[PDB]
Each structure stands twice: as C-alpha cells, then as structure tokens.
C-alpha cells in the first residue's frame, strides 16, 4: 500500500453455493484510523457474470480491474465470455508480474453456466486458487475458524447469505478496518444481484 | 533482499606438474551446515587436455564452465579445430569473468 492512497481491507468473502456463487464484502474504506469512505463498494464487475473481490490497494484494484475488464471485454468482444478461470488468469498475470509494484489481494469469482459459480483467490503472491469459497482482507483473519466450521458446499442461496452475513459481521465486529455495510452480490444462472445490509441488522446476528 | 550469491562449500586445489598437471577439489557440496551432495564432482575437463574447476558459488562457475566450454567449441569452429592454448583460455576466461565485472 502506497503512502496517501485509501486502504481497503474491510473483509471480502466469496462463496459458491448450490445455485452459484455469491460475493460479499464490507463497504468500509479507511486511511488509518480514519475511515475514508464507509459506504464504498469493493465488489466489482469486470465482466457480466465474472466479478472480483478487491483487496489490497484500492488504486491497484480499481486500476487493475478495468484492465482485466478491458481485456476480457476485448477478449469477449473477440471470443465471447471467457471462463471465470480465464478471467483470473488475467489478474494473475498483472498481479504476478506487477506484484512488486502491486499490493492487492483479489478474490475473482464469476458465474459460469457449465461451471455454475466459481471462485478464484489471488493473494498478493499472485498465486491463483479455485475454491469452494474464499475470504480475504483484514477481517478475514477473525473468521477462518468460523467460516471453515460453518461452511458447506451447495448450501442454499440464503444459507450462504447468512453464513456470509454472519461471517462478515464478525470480521466487521472484530476488525476495525471492516465495517460500513455488507454489500452482497449474487452470481447464478438467474443473473447478477447486489444485496446490501445495514449495520442495525448484521451487527446483530 | 534476495542475495545474488551464496556458497556451496568445497575447496579446490590446482597444481602445475612440470611435465604433467593435476587439479582436484572435494566431491562434497554443502549449504551452510547441510551437505548438498557428498558426491558432487566439482572439477571438469573442458577439452584439449585442459581441465577446469571453479570453487565458489557453484551455479556461477557452473554456467561459467559451461560458457567456457562453449567458447572452446567456437574456438575450434573458428580456428578450425586448432587446439586452444592453456594460456589463451585464461586470457579468454578473464574476459568472461571481467565480462561480469560489475
């Protein structure tokens, strides 16, 4: 993270479920103890069903994403929808290449028809992993035990949701950097759906 | 920071014979207190009845020795398989070494 840019952190988690994957992250962006923008969406679309959880330097992610979005769009404008995996490959490249200049972790997730939902983590190492679910950002620290014990495959949409909803709330609860509101994004064959949650709810779970 | 260098351990000994010549070092390769390979031949004939060994960070000398024999090949190409004089290689290798001067 460079000196003077806003720090993301918050808590990003993406979980595949029986009908697909849903992405969620806190809304809170901070520079030090100061919360730069509490409402900021960290969930981002590079591509129609292909999406990303942005952690690390917001500038990086913000900058990186469109680049991927660019190429994918270009790629799609050529060859159509890439695999959510292929999308990850794009990030990895820039990540793995510019890692020395880049501080970003990225959970890449996209809904494929054939693959249903998918999740791909790219930590700052530029490595890539397809996962049933993934978490990253600062608050992710607190929730691993929670997540793992509580995670299941092919849960419902909503089972995942609350599993998400609780997990983040913990991170939001425990992490300072995690907070604002819980933005969730739905990835299925049904389509893309953003979901928001206000503290007065998820703070209480 | 990544260190470009290290040591693989193992001392080498040259001796010029009057009529003959001999060179030797151990076969032991190590890292710190860990033995890389008890048997790791460190000394190499490069051809023309001329043998070479580089003791230090191996991969350096390794690629070097490699590069050197490479030079030998082209020498024979260009000098029409003339034998390379033991001194010449030195003058040559000096360049190779000094080619890395910095």
């Amino acid at each position: 993270l460079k000196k003077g840019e806003v720090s993301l952190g918050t808590s990003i988690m993406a979980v595949t479920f029986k009908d697909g994957v849903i992405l969620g992250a806190d809304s809170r962006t901070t520079t030090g103890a100061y919360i730069a923008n509490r409402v900021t969406d960290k969930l981002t679309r590079v591509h129609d069903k292909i999406w990303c959880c942005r952690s690390g330097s917001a500038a990086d992610t913000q900058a990186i994403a469109d680049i991927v979005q660019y190429h994918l769009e270009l790629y799609t404008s050529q060859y159509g929808t890439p695999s959510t995996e292929t999308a990850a490959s794009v990030f990895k490249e820039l990540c793995y290449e510019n890692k020395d200049n880049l501080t970003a972790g990225i959970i890449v997730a996209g809904y494929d028809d054939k693959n249903k939902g998918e999740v791909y983590t790219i930590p700052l190492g530029g490595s890539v992993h397809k996962l049933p679910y993934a978490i990253a950002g600062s608050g992710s620290t607190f929730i691993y035990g929670y997540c793992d014990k509580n995670f299941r495959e092919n849960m419902s949409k909503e089972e995942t949701v609350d599993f998400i909803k609780h997990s983040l709330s913990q991170a939001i609860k425990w992490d300072g950097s995690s907070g604002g509101v819980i933005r969730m994004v739905v990835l299925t064959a049904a389509g893309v759906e953003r979901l928001i949650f206000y503290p007065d709810e998820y703070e209480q779970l | 920071q990544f260190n470009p260098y290290g040591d693989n351990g193992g001392t080498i000994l040259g001796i010029a014979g009057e009529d003959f010549a001999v060179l030797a070092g151990d076969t032991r390769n190590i890292t710190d207190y860990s033995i890389n390979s008890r048997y790791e031949p460190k000394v190499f004939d490069c051809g023309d009845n001329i043998v070479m060994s580089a003791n230090g960070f191996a991969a350096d000398g390794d690629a070097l020795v490699k590069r050197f024999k490479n030079s030998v090949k082209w020498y024979h190409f260009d000098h029409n398989d003339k034998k390379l004089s033991i001194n010449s290689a030195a003058r040559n290798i000096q360049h190779l070494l000094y080619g890395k001067r910095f």
């Binding site: - | 490479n70 090949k73 082209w74």
Partner: protein, 233 residues
C-alpha cells in the same frame, strides 16, 4: 516480365513464383557437387572440393556444426557459413538450454523457417546455397537436404550441385544396399565414393578434390579429407 517478376523476392510470378528463389536455386546447380547418404547406423557426407586454380586450394564443401551434426554445401559459401554458425548456436543452444543434442529433423525446421524469412521479407534475398546435412541422434542417423526455398527433406542418400543427378539416380539406383550397410561406413563411404564418381564428369575425385565427412552411431560428426579419403579414392 522477367525484369518485372524476376526482380524482387517479394513478388510472385503471374504463375505465383519467385525467380530470385529460382535463381538462387539455380546457383545450387552452378555450385560444385557434394554427395551424401546414410545408413541407420551412420550417415555419410561426400564432397568434391573445387579450387579456383591448382595454385589455389580446393574449397571445402563440408561443415561441422556439432559433434552429432554437421553439413555439406553446394552453392554460395557465406550463406551456409551464416547458417551453419546460426545452426551451430542452435545445437549448442539446445545443448546449452536443454543439454540436448539438436534433433536433425528439428534442426532442419529452423533453417527451413529461417530462410523462409528472406522469401517473404522485402529487402533481402534467399541464401545462395542448397544444403545437405547429416546427423546421428536418438533417432539415429539422418540425412537432410535443404532448399533455399526453405524446403528440407530427410533422405537415405542424395547429392546436390553441378550434375549431382547421375549419382542421385545411382544412389536411388543403389538404394537398399547402403542403407542396409550398417556399421560398415567404409562401404557406406565406398557407396558414396562410387556415387560421387557417377556425377563425376570432368575429372576423377582426388585426395584433395574429394572431401568426406561422417557422423554415425558412435561416430561423431567428423570429416575425412585427403589421406583420410585416400583408401577410399
């Protein structure tokens, strides 16, 4: 038309042809003759070394690019020297990068594709030499012919340059014999000896006229000149 279509490497004939190539291909014939053949165990290079004069020496038509690999040439020498060196690197490169003796076939591809640049690329010219190349490898002995068109071919035997056709027939005429000759390079030689004699027209090969090279199973790519060829003269 000629001056129109023969001028530039980049320009097809109305029939879609490259006369510069065809001319470059011509110089092959202008070049002296060299001969080559292989067993499965061995591959033989046989060249007739041409002079300017008797006061001059006989230009060597044969080149070693490697221990398993070297070549012969009929055509403009420098191109080969360019290519041979280029090739030598590759073999050495393969030897460097992969610790791998360059596959004779895989070797030809590069040169095939290399001159192919000259072909389609304006400003240049194809190489002025057709090439015979032998190598022994994990796939064994191999004889590869090159064309300045880029076209490469793996043969049992062949010859190029001036009037190489006679032996070429004789080789084809002799086909199954030498290829069966295995571990006896001598006959493999003496076959090629009789071969190059076929397209010998003006004179007989001599100690200096003839040039011989061989790679084989345990035979590294090597060259026999003069006294070496004497017993085979």
């Amino acid at each position: 038309f000629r001056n129109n279509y023969d001028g530039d490497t980049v320009t097809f004939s109305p029939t879609g042809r490259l006369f510069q190539v065809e001319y470059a291909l011509e110089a092959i014939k202008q070049g002296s003759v060299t001969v080559g053949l292989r067993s499965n165990t061995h591959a033989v290079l046989v060249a007739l070394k041409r002079n300017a004069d008797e006061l001059s020496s006989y230009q060597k038509k044969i080149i070693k690019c490697d221990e398993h690999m070297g070549l012969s040439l009929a055509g403009l020498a420098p191109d080969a020297r360019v290519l041979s060196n280029y090739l030598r690197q590759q073999c050495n490169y393969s030897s460097l990068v992969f610790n791998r003796k360059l596959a004779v076939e895989r070797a030809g591809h590069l040169l095939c594709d290399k001159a192919q640049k000259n072909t389609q690329s304006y400003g240049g010219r194809p190489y002025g030499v057709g090439l015979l190349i032998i190598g022994y490898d994990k796939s064994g002995a191999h004889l590869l012919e090159f064309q300045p068109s880029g076209n490469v071919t793996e043969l049992y035997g062949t010859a190029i340059g001036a009037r190489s056709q006679g032996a070429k027939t004789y080789l084809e005429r002799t086909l199954d014999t030498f290829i069966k000759i295995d571990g006896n390079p001598d006959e493999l030689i003496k076959a090629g000896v009789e071969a190059i004699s076929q397209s010998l027209r003006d004179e007989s090969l001599t100690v200096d006229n003839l040039s011989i090279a061989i790679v084989g199973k345990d035979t590294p790519f090597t060259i026999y000149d003069g006294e070496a060829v004497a017993k085979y003269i």
